[PDB]
Design a protein around this ligand. Sequence first.
Ligand SMILES: NC(=O)c1ccc[n+]([C@@H]2O[C@H](COP(=O)([O-])OP(=O)(O)OC[C@H]3O[C@@H](n4cnc5c(N)ncnc54)[C@H](O)[C@@H]3O)[C@@H](O)[C@H]2O)c1
Ligand SMILES: NC(=O)c1ccc[n+]([C@@H]2O[C@H](COP(=O)([O-])OP(=O)(O)OC[C@H]3O[C@@H](n4cnc5c(N)ncnc54)[C@H](O)[C@@H]3O)[C@@H](O)[C@H]2O)c1
Lengths: 331, 331
Amino acid sequence: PRPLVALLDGRDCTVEMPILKDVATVAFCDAQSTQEIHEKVLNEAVGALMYHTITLTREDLEKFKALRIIVRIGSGFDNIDIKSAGDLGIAVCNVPAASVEETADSTLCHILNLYRRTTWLHQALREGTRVQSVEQIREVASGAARIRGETLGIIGLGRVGQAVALRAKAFGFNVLFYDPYLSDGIERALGLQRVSTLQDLLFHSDCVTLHCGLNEHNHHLINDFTVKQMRQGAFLVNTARGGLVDEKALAQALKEGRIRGAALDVHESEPFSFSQGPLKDAPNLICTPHAAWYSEQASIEMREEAAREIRRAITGRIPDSLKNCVNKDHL
Amino acid sequence: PRPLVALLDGRDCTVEMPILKDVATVAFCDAQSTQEIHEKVLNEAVGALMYHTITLTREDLEKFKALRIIVRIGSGFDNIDIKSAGDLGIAVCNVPAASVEETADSTLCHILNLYRRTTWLHQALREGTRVQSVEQIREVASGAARIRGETLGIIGLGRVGQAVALRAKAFGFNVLFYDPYLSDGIERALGLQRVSTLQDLLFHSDCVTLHCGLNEHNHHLINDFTVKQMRQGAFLVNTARGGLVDEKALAQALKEGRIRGAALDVHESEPFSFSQGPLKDAPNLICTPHAAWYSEQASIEMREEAAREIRRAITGRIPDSLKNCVNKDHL
Ligand SMILES: NC(=O)c1ccc[n+]([C@@H]2O[C@H](COP(=O)([O-])OP(=O)(O)OC[C@H]3O[C@@H](n4cnc5c(N)ncnc54)[C@H](O)[C@@H]3O)[C@@H](O)[C@H]2O)c1
Ligand SMILES: NC(=O)c1ccc[n+]([C@@H]2O[C@H](COP(=O)([O-])OP(=O)(O)OC[C@H]3O[C@@H](n4cnc5c(N)ncnc54)[C@H](O)[C@@H]3O)[C@@H](O)[C@H]2O)c1
């Protein structure tokens, strides 16, 4: 027969079918937890495709008896224990840049929304606020600032980070970044300022934007400690990973006024909701349901790509046939 | 004594005082209509400073017996009959570019908000909408599109228009403009595509943004007729003047789905309100209280500039001492 491949936290396989039809048996679990995965999958599944709504711990992975590959349909793979999966002889792959630009564009939208207060002005206009005179325009739009000369501090100058830096220049932002893993000289190639430490970046930035993956070393990068290093009344943007920020610290900082405002597309606990979590009633906070990456073309693109990776894996050799394996070291 | 100068539709003169103290007698009317202006002003006022919340018709101007100059504290001067004022020997001046960039930045914010649906996703998140699965992200974020390759059609390649074009390139927008008053060749200097007619621009643009002043020839530039020339499901942005768009036509087009969405910072009838006007319940519509221009620095900048113009006028000669007179022809 043809190897079984399962879509863990999803139920739509229309885009992948044309590509896997003759080489695999497609199936979906639409699971909201690993406990929701059926026995037949854990026993026979050779490949697996998953999104970000489900986590896979070592315990989870050990329950698969034939799993040979897990392809993340997206960028981040922090929801998967690449290490354990590797030891278990399970190759983990992702989809690197199908939405790099969708993400940079949303990032810029958040940045501008904080500086120009577009969303808040609209939200207030819906609240019935009246704005007839200039004095009232100034009051309702209070805080809107002139962007030219502001310092945008980027944390993580990777694919998205670079796309953000380039867009940022056009608005007159002075751009500087921090990324301890990059080789020296990239800052010269793109004409950007680089700093050696996080505190350095935080201290000189008027607006801080996260663009690094969530790893074993940056959990809660933004702490009650580091938040204290940020400028007074600085903006914070995060379209990377919720786990990079300690919402409790952020909430406090937002109430005290230390941070003028934050735009978050990702949160420590997703699904996100204003009714619960440390961000409840937190002042000047704009949120989005983790859609920074979305655009129909990108969704379609990343799915056909994930599908092809599965195909290469089933028809070729692991990890030789794979194009985006992220745990070769543990294999 | 020192000539009387009055602030028509406003009541704050703190920023102008330091500059006019020894050469003029400051006063304010905080008028919401010309009928609200007091007799002493119409009789003795030599200079006048005004915003955009009040209109001045020929009838209005003729009621001044000593008015020698009117300085608009801002960019647009369509609310003033420059022609009549000129015939009445009244010089009209404005403040050209104190907020050029604030405006371009808001314009970009609106453009991105339509493409990335940041504001709507946030507004829905407040409505209690739940977004836990990928399928739901795709549904709630439906319509968010990949910007690269989209055609941004700019109408009016002046100060703001140019700032918008430059920012737009960085997002991968193919930029093209229409501006029948510019000399030939500006498109070569900035590396942009230019078209000869409005229909031309409208037909090839995925997103249309207005950046022209409101004049005797473009009232309701966007009509039931011209709207029909726009692409199917095109976006419309307007941070220029409300009078450039026939809200009735826009409303219809928005309901029928011909126009996927619109972002308006200006409206035919300001103060704007969702409770009244042709835009009531109009689908996919984002609005702002005419704050595209605001930033404390710009507000301060334009006021000290207007103040200096008044000073030059009172201490020098009209229209020789003026730096930004917009009705020299009628003088
Ligand atoms: N909100 C969304 O829908 C969305 C969209 C795209 C990507 N993701 C987020 O963005 C990340 C991927 O970005 P790319 O930009 O696609 O990734 P890359 O292309 O993986 O870039 C990430 C960069 O982060 C740097 N980095 C790691 N740890 C760091 C630290 N402690 N300090 C500073 N820099 C650090 C790396 O060295 C690397 O250059 C994902 O891991 C995820 O968190 C989310
Ligand atoms: N929303 C706000 O707060 C805000 C902020 C700044 C300016 N204003 C708006 O923007 C205008 C000023 O822009 P600039 O960009 O400052 O002005 P300019 O610098 O006066 O530019 C306007 C351009 O419009 C062009 N134009 C006139 N009629 C046209 C037509 N029918 N078709 C195409 N182009 C046409 C002109 O030739 C000119 O190049 C004002 O008149 C006003 O309507 C509003």
